[PDB]
Design a protein around this nucleic acid. Structure first.
Lengths: 80, 86, 205, 82
RNA sequence: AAAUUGAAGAGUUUGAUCAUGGCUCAGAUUGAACGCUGGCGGCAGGCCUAACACAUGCAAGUCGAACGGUAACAGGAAGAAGCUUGCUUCUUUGCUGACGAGUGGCGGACGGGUGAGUAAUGUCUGGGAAACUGCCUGAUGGAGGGGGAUAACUACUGGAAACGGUAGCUAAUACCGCAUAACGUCGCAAGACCAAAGAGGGGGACCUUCGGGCCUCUUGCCAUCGGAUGUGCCCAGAUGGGAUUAGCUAGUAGGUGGGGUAACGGCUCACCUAGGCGACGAUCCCUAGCUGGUCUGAGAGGAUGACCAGCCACACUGGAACUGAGACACGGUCCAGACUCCUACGGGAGGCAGCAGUGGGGAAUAUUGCACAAUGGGCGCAAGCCUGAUGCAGCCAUGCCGCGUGUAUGAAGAAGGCCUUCGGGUUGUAAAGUACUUUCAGCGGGGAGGAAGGGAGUAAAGUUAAUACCUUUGCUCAUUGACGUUACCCGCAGAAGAAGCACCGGCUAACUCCGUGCCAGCAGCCGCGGUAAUACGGAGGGUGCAAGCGUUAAUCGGAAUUACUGGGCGUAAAGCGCACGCAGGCGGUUUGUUAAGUCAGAUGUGAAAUCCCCGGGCUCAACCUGGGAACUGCAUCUGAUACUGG
């Protein structure tokens, strides 16, 4: 029982740290059309493990730097 | 100051400032002695300074002048660093 | 807050009896009811669609004594309620005290019955109500109080109520000088010469 | 501290008092935590005129809240008659 | 049971027509202003401009049950002696009722104001982990024993003042050790270390250095873990305009280690890596406090954020800390700056965006009022004191709602006015005349409710060594209202004291004379006026609103005229000169699976007020209020799997 988002890994140049786009399908308020709106997040990865392109899953912990409050639960898919 | 309360209360706080300043300087000075003995590379001088620091900073927490948790950081931080030497 | 003018100038503009003088003398002796009021009356107009809606509202207003700011408020209420908004609007004018007085026949006209009401001659359920727009409910008694049984006005008025038609929705008990507003009147009970759809059309422009 | 008190409402010269578990620093009519009952001092006396919630007041006195002068009197008086 | 029942067009392009398309009008609303007019009341509202400058008064104190105390003015006492034997004039006394100044405590971080700054160290919705929290409350224990000061006060002294300087003097719940020490902190553990304060009311014994000890109750003090409240911090989404602003960023983005914070953290620093943000609008410029709400709309929308309530920010401008549970502090401190005053020229003093008020600006916005009686707040055991919060009054048709200014009767239809085909018509049952009524205003009389409590007395039970005291519960007596000459009720006199404003060419309800002659003027748009003007000015009549009526300004509407709902592009405005093509949008058919979109159900939240429904209370209404519905949202959980997606 933890709230846990999923996403995929649009950078990993940083040391122990990755960047992770979360997609979501929003109805536009006026026009009714469902839209891809993206939510980027800096994420704590211990062990430098996650590659670029990789699907992943993340949770909200305490603050770890200026940007990061999000830490990497597990990888799902990869190396693609 | 217009109000009687305010005149008085400015005097009281200038008294307490001069007092608190002294107690704060003292408390730092004993903490500086331990970081001096750590930088020397010197286990039992630094352990002797830690035992003279310790009763001061725990009292100054009780008197109000620092907080309980600041006291504890100062102990924790030195206790760690004297254990890295010996 | 009240029409103080000539009462038969009003009756000529509608082309109708608005009941604004009692019927001690009948209507066609006094004025000229066919001819419209003032200098240019005998000339016809082609009266427009706004015109006939206005002309009908002002007929209803001038019967019951009500001014526009207050009538507009009755209309808002009447629409707010659940029901035909024409039928509701005529319920709220037959609820008024100054009218209910006159329909029991303590006033000769609505302008008399309004002077009763204003001058603290009327109680409702024992309490002295002295404001014309008071909305009487089902199973209220209205009744005259004890100075105002001894007036000539009220006795001579009760003679004139026997020659007019009887309302169904009131039970009058005229020796005591009281009577019971029993239920709200339906559209059938009221005069069918009043078109109400015209008033509702008017405001919903 | 937390209190239990009367906030004034109503028109002019015809008050009406809600009963409000506030923090005491907040202004009389401002920010309350709960509302708990009411009190009409102009009431007809054929038709209610005071209703407290005794089950939720006693909860707040439990957790350690004060009461006014007046709200005390209103509790004394709504345990006599009812 | 009920909680939404909702949608009107017209004028103007043409010789005429249909279409396109602009302009204009009819509605609602307002913190409004201006003009003409003006009787009463009820409930609201009232510097939108210069976050310009402010004279004067008031807006934060309280505590003697923490302390040393006497300068006041109350008594009392020894005692001079009024001396007229007790009627007390004048000398002492902190002896006690009290209490100026001083130490100390608690409060001056609340309450009150304003919207300048702020497009995010903000707001709204929903989540979260790494925190502190005076007053209040639950539990658990502690409260032993010593020290040196200094304000006051005394003596001298400097300064024009503001404010100070010397040398002595003394106290505490002021301040500092020591003892004490665990479910507290540091530590892997062994171990190491951390506090405190007394004051009151009464008292049967019993001792005394007659002070008290001693018993008891109330009350405070210290530590620890809880609770409640309040606050801090983080993440996701939502939160104006501009691309004739496209590249921005080096504590910048991440790491390791030190330092810092109540707490996580580039918060800070040293080293290291070279990142981070951006067409899903970075950066830059302009504008703006945000929300609940409000106005408009059939709705979807658009406009707005005045009063009431929540959050934020600011306190003459800029900077900074100190005290403290809490401030980087409207009526505190220090610094710089501008402005204003005082000065013996050395130096000083101040900050209405608290309430009234003044000037100034401005189309425009109020009394230098009464009271803490009620509800809150601060201090106090309490009495009580304080409270420009608040409750009331004043001013103003600024707005909403109610009532009034009479009622019935009254004809050849008076006069006078106006028109007239000179017959008469109209003002008009209008007036006069005759009957009746007296609301509201004016003059008299009575009179609720907002008051709950607190005090002075007894009575019982608790409390205890005690019928003291204290506390809890009932009883009796005298009391507490600013508003206020109150609401409301009764009596008196006499129709008496109380109607205007706009309009009448069409749109648009209402028409005729006289003057005027493209002049004077009118006008929202079409347009009217050049000698018969229903369009100008006056008169008579009429229409519409009515204590108001009009003009102007502003928003929505109408406007399907920015079209999601709901428009178009051959010739009316509108298809890039044609292609290729990256991001983007969309994607044939079938089985399985997933359950993101989607749908259903449940829980949590969506502040109160507002809106809507059903009720209740003010004579009615506005206004106030009980219950509901609603808050179309967001999150979590459990199902469904046709469609979309994977």
């Amino acid at each position: 029982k933890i709230r846990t988002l999923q996403g995929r890994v649009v950078s990993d140049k940083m040391e122990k740290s990755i960047v992770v786009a979360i997609e979501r399908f929003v109805k536009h308020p006026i026009y009714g059309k469902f839209i891809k709106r993206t939510t980027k997040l800096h994420v704590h990865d211990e062990n430098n493990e996650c590659g670029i392109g990789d699907v992943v899953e993340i949770r909200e912990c305490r603050p770890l730097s200026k940007t990061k409050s999000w830490t990497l639960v597990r990888v799902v898919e990869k190396a693609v | 100051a217009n109000i009687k309360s305010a005149k008085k209360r400015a005097i009281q706080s200038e008294k307490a400032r001069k007092h608190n300043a002294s107690r704060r300087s003292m408390m730092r000075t004993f903490i500086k002695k331990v970081y001096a003995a750590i930088e020397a590379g010197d286990k039992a001088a630094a352990q002797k300074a830690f035992n003279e620091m310790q009763p001061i900073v725990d009292r100054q927490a009780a008197k109000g002048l620092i907080h309980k948790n600041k006291a504890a950081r100062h102990k924790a931080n030195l206790t760690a660093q004297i254990n890295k030497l010996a | 807050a009240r029409y103080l003018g000539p009462k038969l100038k009003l009756s000529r503009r509608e082309g109708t009896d608005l009941f604004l003088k009692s019927g001690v003398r009948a209507i066609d002796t006094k004025c000229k009811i066919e001819q419209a009021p003032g200098q240019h009356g005998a000339r016809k107009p082609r009266l427009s669609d706004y015109g006939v809606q206005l002309r009908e509202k002002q007929k209803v207003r001038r019967i019951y004594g009500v001014l526009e700011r207050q009538f507009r408020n009755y209309y808002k209420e009447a629409a707010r309620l659940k029901g035909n908004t024409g039928e509701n609007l005529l319920a709220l004018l037959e609820g008024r005290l100054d009218n209910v007085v006159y329909r029991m026949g303590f006033g000769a006209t609505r302008a008399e019955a309004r002077q009763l009401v204003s001058h603290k001659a009327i109680m409702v359920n024992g309490r002295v109500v002295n404001i014309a727009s008071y909305q009487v409910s089902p199973n209220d008694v209205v009744s005259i109080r004890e100075k105002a049984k001894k007036q000539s006005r009220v006795k001579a008025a009760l003679e004139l109520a026997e020659q007019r038609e009887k309302p169904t929705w009131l039970e009058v008990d005229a020796g005591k000088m009281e009577g019971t507003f029993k239920r709200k009147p339906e559209r059938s009970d009221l005069s069918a010469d009043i078109n109400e759809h015209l008033i509702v059309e008017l405001y919903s422009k | 501290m937390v209190t239990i008190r009367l906030a004034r409402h109503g028109a002019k010269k015809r008050p009406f008092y809600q009963v409000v578990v506030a923090d005491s620093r907040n202004a009389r009519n401002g920010r309350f935590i709960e509302r708990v009952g009411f009190f009409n001092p102009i009431a007809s006396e054929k038709e209610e005129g005071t209703r407290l919630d005794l089950d939720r007041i006693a909860h707040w006195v439990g957790q350690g809240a004060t009461i006014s002068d007046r709200v005390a009197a209103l509790i004394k008086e709504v345990n006599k008659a009812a």
